[PDB]
Every structure is written in structure tokens, then in C-alpha cells.
Design an enzyme around this catalytic site. Structure first.
Site, short mmCIF file in Angstrom:
data_model
loop_
_atom_site.label_atom_id
_atom_site.label_comp_id
_atom_site.label_asym_id
_atom_site.label_seq_id
_atom_site.Cartn_x
_atom_site.Cartn_y
_atom_site.Cartn_z
N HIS B 251 -68.45 -22.40 106.33
CA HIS B 251 -69.83 -22.80 106.31
C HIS B 251 -70.19 -24.15 106.87
O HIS B 251 -71.39 -24.45 106.94
CB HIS B 251 -70.44 -22.62 104.90
CG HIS B 251 -70.12 -23.71 103.92
ND1 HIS B 251 -70.91 -23.90 102.80
CD2 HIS B 251 -69.18 -24.66 103.88
CE1 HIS B 251 -70.42 -24.90 102.10
NE2 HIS B 251 -69.38 -25.39 102.72
N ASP B 252 -69.16 -24.92 107.18
CA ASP B 252 -69.26 -26.28 107.71
C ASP B 252 -69.50 -26.24 109.20
O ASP B 252 -69.87 -27.29 109.80
CB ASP B 252 -68.07 -27.15 107.41
CG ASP B 252 -67.96 -27.61 105.98
OD1 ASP B 252 -68.94 -27.56 105.18
OD2 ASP B 252 -66.89 -28.08 105.61
N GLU B 279 -66.26 -18.19 100.15
CA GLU B 279 -67.58 -18.68 100.62
C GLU B 279 -68.63 -18.01 99.77
O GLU B 279 -68.43 -16.91 99.21
CB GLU B 279 -67.86 -18.29 102.06
CG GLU B 279 -67.01 -18.92 103.10
CD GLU B 279 -67.41 -20.39 103.42
OE1 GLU B 279 -68.38 -20.90 102.86
OE2 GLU B 279 -66.77 -20.98 104.25
N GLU B 311 -74.91 -20.78 106.02
CA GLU B 311 -74.45 -19.72 105.17
C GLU B 311 -74.59 -18.44 105.96
O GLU B 311 -75.46 -18.29 106.81
CB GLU B 311 -75.24 -19.67 103.86
CG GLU B 311 -75.02 -20.93 103.02
CD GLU B 311 -73.59 -21.37 102.71
OE1 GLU B 311 -72.71 -20.53 102.36
OE2 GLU B 311 -73.31 -22.60 102.67
N1 SAH Z 1 -60.74 -30.61 111.65
C1 SAH Z 1 -60.32 -30.53 110.36
N2 SAH Z 1 -59.12 -30.21 109.97
C2 SAH Z 1 -58.64 -30.17 108.67
N3 SAH Z 1 -59.52 -30.34 107.65
C3 SAH Z 1 -60.82 -30.63 107.96
C4 SAH Z 1 -61.33 -30.73 109.30
N4 SAH Z 1 -62.63 -31.03 109.28
C5 SAH Z 1 -62.96 -31.04 107.97
N5 SAH Z 1 -61.91 -30.82 107.18
C6 SAH Z 1 -61.78 -30.74 105.73
O1 SAH Z 1 -62.58 -29.59 105.32
C7 SAH Z 1 -62.87 -29.85 103.87
C8 SAH Z 1 -64.26 -29.30 103.72
S1 SAH Z 1 -64.88 -29.29 102.02
C9 SAH Z 1 -63.93 -28.03 101.21
C10 SAH Z 1 -62.68 -28.57 100.51
C11 SAH Z 1 -61.79 -27.58 99.75
N6 SAH Z 1 -61.42 -26.39 100.62
C12 SAH Z 1 -62.59 -27.18 98.54
O2 SAH Z 1 -63.27 -26.12 98.67
O3 SAH Z 1 -62.53 -27.92 97.53
C13 SAH Z 1 -62.66 -31.34 103.63
O4 SAH Z 1 -61.63 -31.54 102.75
C14 SAH Z 1 -62.48 -31.88 105.05
O5 SAH Z 1 -61.75 -33.05 105.05
#
Ligand code: SAH
Ligand code: SAH
Ligand code: N7I
Lengths: 353, 347
Positions: B251-252, B279, B311
Site C-alpha cells: 500500500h506504500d 493488507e 488501498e
Molecule cells: N526500499 C525498501 N526496502 C526495504 N524496506 C523498505 C523500503 N522502503 C520502505 N521500507 C520499509 O517498509 C516498512 C513500511 S511500514 C510496515 C512495517 C512492517 N511490515 C509492519 O507492518 O509493522 C518500513 O519499515 C520501511 O522502512
């Protein structure tokens, strides 16, 4: 699954700010106005049609707008309908909910939208980061954030002075229109002083309804400088704690809630001095209900009380008894709750009863 | 009438940001914990009695706290009774805002959500809609993850927030979902400080786990038996294992970025491996259910923070799985509004 409901609620609490900030963006984009003027006979319009009226022309605008409008729709800020596209997928179309009547310009060009822009301003959200500090250290969260009282800060910062004064003007215009349909107590005065009158919306409305009345709008210099001229209103700058202009009655709307009991008594003794023998103070405020019930009317007053704690030096919401106590301690012999409109009570503090 | 109600609603909308900031203050003062440990059997305690446990001699602290708790009471965040002085107690939501048996709550998650750093992007939403780009980047001049790698404070706040929320959701998921059975190596991609990995290893001591995230995150990860913390960038590729777990990662990112990650996942896996995705799943309308509001709120948050993050529906997730080479798809499980999907390499 009492658990499931509690976990959801905690999430909802955590994200609650996203709703007003989404609404703020929608206002700053003029989306609700674009909707009011474009909507077809159905009542609904697409985010793509909305977005073609915005100055962008970001190809991602229509989808970003849809995502914002979807959040507002979930809370019934806007209405929605679904339409199935051949190109199977269903889209949302959006319409105006009843609340939008107050978030878009009425027949006279007024709405609550500028009040919402004040409530969501970066300056008013900052004091909330210093609530814990004020509790433990003493003092006012706003003063921890900015290093001076709210009014003094407005005197330094032209942008927020204007947002604040416009926001109060809008809210007051909407409420006072309704108060003036119900409350008769301005009838027969020849001169009215609005103390802390802002840019003079209320004074102007009183003159418009009662053309013979002479109104004085009194506020701080830095406010009075931006007050538009209105025939029948004189804008005077000064400091109410030093004294107020003389008149047959004095109107104070949303002034007492800004100030401690001691500050209120100081003001109210100055009002008493400025009035003739049988004159009065007209007080327009919320009145605190007995309990934190979950009604929206109570919730709104309690929210304001919390805002007063964030912003103001000793400001707070008060019960009818508390107001009657202030009247008494500043020398008034009578007290009346006279009228109510849009959750705002009009009280009279009478020098003789 | 209808006008009175609509006027009231505009006012309620205008001040809705302060509810969580009031709650933030209560959590920062430790008020909910003080209540939990101090209430008598009645379940209620006075603001003066709470304030006497705070590190203050401000004589106004009691009344100030009373006013804050009154707001929280109006929203059913805390309970109340009258004795007239108000006493306050914990409502059911407080169980998630105070440490449970395992020492975990959502309080760090609320502190994340209300942090000054994450509220700032919302002032640039209008700018992003009109000019393009990302509200976060407009505020800070870099993307969110890079900002975290410059600001130790907020890094810590974010990772603890995610850790707390994930530990609560994942414990419920792991009662429900059996798809981690039989793996030897699970890779948690974007697994933060490793809470989820450590929970997987604890339920299946036979599994060994790689907790993989950015170096500035892995720096702060505590050690846990049978988890290895590995710094890197998931877009360069991901560690090998029998399965990959991605929670709140898709979702990021935009569809194009999800595909890049998902092809990396495909390549790190054997012919028989799968990607396990946790998700929210978007429901078919902006209905008023709290469950749907929560997913829509998150969608709007992704709009503020991330490049094309959003989402998605089930159908969309399955299309991502297809387009990245996975031939199987299923929705396996759900708990606390979080779905677990499997993207399977074979039919
Ligand atoms: N290119 C990349 N490679 C590895 N991790 C990454 C990234 N870009 C973002 N992230 C990681 O993606 C996470 C998104 S937040 C979700 C964190 C964890 N899966 C949970 O649900 O608690 C963060 O910890 C961030 O540092
Ligand atoms: N010492 C002082 N003397 C006069 N006005 C003051 C004051 N301190 C604050 N104010 C004014 O008090 C007002 C409070 S806000 C209410 C404005 C207006 N009555 C309305 O309801 O729309 C502001 O305009 C502010 O500048
Ligand atoms: C500080 O004085 C006031 C503030 C508000 C809230 C403004 C929000 O940013 C509403 C009424 C007042 O008298």
C-alpha cells in the site's frame, strides 16, 4: 470481537485528523463550490468533471480528488452514487450533503468555509503539541508554542490575523442571522457597542436590521485596521481591559470564553461603568451542559472548552450558573437567558432588576 | 432543525483534529496507565488523584486534566461518573491504549499518528493535487523513508508504532492462518524492527527468519532468537527464502513499484514458493461502517505520504499477482481488518 470493535475504534481515533484536513484541501481547491454550480438534475458529478475546473493540469488530479472525496463521502460530508461503466469498474459520482449548505456561499456570499480554514490552520494546530507541557509546567499551550498570548501573536502575523478575523466573521454572520430572527433585545436601543467585535460583521448586521441604531465596533488596533467601513458603524481600536466605549447596551460575543473568571470580572466592571443606569450587557456564548453526553451539541461545547484550554489565558466554557455568578460579581442585579440559536445562547446582564 | 443539525455538524468537523491531540496528551502524561493501575473497584478516579501521580506542582493541573478527560469522555474514549465532580474510568478502547498482558498496546501507534512530522504533509495536499507530486516531499524536500533516516526521533516513533500495531494484529492472524507451516526460511520484507518475524519464529521454532528493511531501521532492531536482521533495499532485490511476507508494504507504492518489488520476490523464491501479503482490502463503496472508514482513512493517508501508494481491492491485488508472474491467488485469512493473501508461483 468486542476486541475487533475496540481495535477499529482505536484506529479511527488515531486517524481522525485526516477528515478535517481532507475537507480543508477540498475547500482550498474550491471543490464544493465547483460542485454546487455544476451538478446536473440528478444531484451528482464525477471527480473528472470537477477536476477539469481546477487550475492543474496534473493527469493524477482526478484520481487524487476521487480519493479525497471518498473520505468525505464515508463521513457524509458529500453524498455519492455509483455508476457502472461499460469498462467495468464502477465509479463514484459526488453530490452535496446538507452540511454543504454551510460550506458553500449562501445567497449573501457567506459560509462556514473560512471558519473551517481557521480551525485547520497550522497555527491553531501547533498549540496542541504543548498541552502536556502546559499541564506539567503551568501556563498556556499556545504561549508555549509561540512565546506570547494569542492576540499578541495575531498582531505580529498578518496572515493568521486575517484568517482568524475572516473565520470569526463568517461564523458570526451565520449565527447572528439566526439570533436576530429570535432575539428582540436590540429593539429600542439608540447606541450598541460590540466589544471584541472583530472586523464588525455583527455590528453591521445589527445596523442593517435596526437602521436607526448607532453601532460602535471596538477591538484591538491590529483588528480594527482591517475592518471594512459600514455606514452606521464606527470602528474604534483599544483595549477592553482599560475601558470600553459608552453605549446604551454592550454586546460581547465569544469574549468571556476567552478569559479567566478574573479577567471576565475586570471586563464586565468596565462594561458596567460604560453603561447608563438601567443599561445592560448582552452576552452571546455557549452554555455548558451538566455532563459529557455523546450528543453532538454537548460534544461541540466541550470541544470548544478544550480549544479554550489550548489557546487562551484562562478561557473556558461556562454553565448558566457560572455566568449568573459573573454578572452578580461585577455589579449587575438581573440575569436572563433570553434566546438561543445554532447552539449559542444570548444572555442579558441587567444593571437593574 | 435540519439547519441546526447541519450547522452543528460543520462545527464538529472543524474541530475533529483535536480529539486525537487530546488523546496524545493523555498518553504522553501516562494518564491511561495511571488510571488502569490506580482505579478502585468502582472503576473511577478523580482528576486530582490522577494529577497527584504526575511530576508537577502546577496547582491547575487537576482542572486542566479534568477538561481534557471531559473531552475524551464525550467521545467515549474514557468513561465517567458524577460524585458535582467528575470521576473517570477506562472504556473498552483503552484496553488497546494501555499495555496488555504481553506489555503491548496501540499507544505507540497513536503517538505516531499524531506526531508533528506526520501532520505537516497534510498542509500540502492542495499543492500536490494541483502541481503534482507528494504532499510529504513538498513539506520536507525528500521522501518519507529518507526523512526517517535523517531524524532518529521520528524513526524510533514510526518503528515502535508499526511494531506495536503489527504485534497486536499478527497475534490474532497467527491463531487463524496456518500458511507459515512447513517453511524453513521466511523473509519479512519491509519487516521493520522485526516484531512479526520474531512472532513467526516463536510459534514455529523450526522456521528461521530474515527480517529485512532499510539500514536506518535495522540499526534499531533488537535481537531475537532465530531471526537475522538484514539491511538493504527491496527494490534492488530481496533475500532468498521458501516464502516472503510483506505486511503494509504494497500500500506504500504505486502499481509500477509494487510490480518491481513483486518480481524481486518472485526471483528470490523457489519454483514452489509464495508471497504472503497482509493488507487491508478496499470494500466496494464509501459506506459508514467503521471498518470501511478505517481503510478509506488509510487510503487518504497514503495519498499524503507516498508515491502512488493506495488501498486496493481484491481484484487489483490479484492483477498485481498475475502481472508479476504468480499464477495462483487466494485470500487466506482475516483478522482485525487485515487480510492475508497468498500469491502462488504455480496454478
Ligand atoms: N526500499 C525498501 N526496502 C526495504 N524496506 C523498505 C523500503 N522502503 C520502505 N521500507 C520499509 O517498509 C516498512 C513500511 S511500514 C510496515 C512495517 C512492517 N511490515 C509492519 O507492518 O509493522 C518500513 O519499515 C520501511 O522502512
Ligand atoms: N484586550 C482586548 N480588547 C478588545 N478586543 C480584544 C481584546 N483581546 C482580544 N480581543 C478581541 O476579542 C475577539 C475574540 S473572538 C470573537 C470575535 C467576535 N465577537 C465574533 O464573535 O465573531 C477578537 O476579535 C480579539 O481581537
Ligand atoms: C481564541 O479565541 C477563539 C478561538 C476559536 C477557535 C479558533 C481555531 O483556530 C473560536 C473562538 C474564539 O473566541
Amino acid at each position: 470481537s468486542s476486541d475487533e470493535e475496540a481495535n477499529l475504534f482505536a484506529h479511527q481515533l488515531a486517524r481522525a485528523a485526516s477528515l478535517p484536513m481532507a475537507l480543508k484541501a477540498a475547500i482550498e481547491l474550491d471543490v464544493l463550490e465547483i460542485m454546487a454550480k455544476s451538478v446536473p438534475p440528478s444531484g451528482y458529478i464525477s471527480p473528472a468533471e470537477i477536476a477539469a475546473q481546477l487550475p492543474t493540469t496534473n493527469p493524477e488530479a482526478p484520481v487524487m480528488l476521487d480519493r479525497v472525496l471518498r473520505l468525505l463521502a464515508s463521513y457524509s460530508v458529500v453524498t455519492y452514487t455509483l455508476r457502472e461503466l461499460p469498462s467495468g469498474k464502477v465509479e463514484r459520482l459526488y453530490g452535496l450533503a446538507p452540511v454543504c449548505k454551510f460550506l458553500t456561499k449562501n445567497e449573501d456570499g457567506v459560509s462556514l468555509a473560512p471558519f473551517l480554514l481557521l480551525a485547520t490552520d497550522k497555527v491553531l494546530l501547533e498549540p496542541w503539541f504543548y498541552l502536556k507541557d502546559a499541564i506539567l509546567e503551568g501556563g498556556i499551550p499556545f504561549n508555549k508554542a509561540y512565546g506570547m498570548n494569542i492576540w499578541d501573536y495575531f498582531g505580529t502575523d498578518h496572515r493568521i490575523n486575517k484568517v482568524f478575523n475572516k473565520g470569526m466573521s463568517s461564523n458570526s454572520t451565520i449565527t447572528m442571522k439566526k439570533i436576530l430572527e429570535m432575539y428582540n433585545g436590540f429593539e429600542g436601543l439608540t447606541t450598541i457597542v460590540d466589544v471584541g467585535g472583530g472586523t464588525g460583521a455583527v455590528a453591521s448586521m445589527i445596523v442593517a436590521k435596526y437602521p436607526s441604531i448607532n453601532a460602535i465596533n471596538f477591538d484591538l488596533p491590529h483588528v480594527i485596521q482591517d475592518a471594512p467601513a459600514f455606514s452606521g458603524v464606527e470602528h474604534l481600536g483599544g483595549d477592553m481591559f482599560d475601558g470600553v466605549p459608552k453605549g446604551d447596551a454592550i454586546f460581547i460575543k465569544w469574549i468571556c470564553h476567552d478569559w479567566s473568571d478574573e479577567h471576565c470580572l475586570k471586563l464586565l466592571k468596565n462594561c458596567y461603568a460604560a453603561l447608563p443606569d438601567h443599561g445592560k450587557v448582552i452576552v452571546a456564548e455557549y452554555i455548558l451542559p451538566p455532563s459529557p453526553d455523546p450528543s453532538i451539541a454537548t460534544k461541540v461545547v466541550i470541544h470548544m472548552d478544550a480549544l479554550m484550554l489550548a489557546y487562551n489565558p484562562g478561557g473556558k466554557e461556562r454553565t448558566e450558573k457560572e455566568f449568573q455568578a459573573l454578572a452578580m460579581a461585577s455589579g449587575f442585579r438581573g440575569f436572563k437567558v433570553a434566546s438561543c440559536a445554532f447552539n449559542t445562547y444570548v444572555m442579558e446582564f441587567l444593571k437593574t432588576a
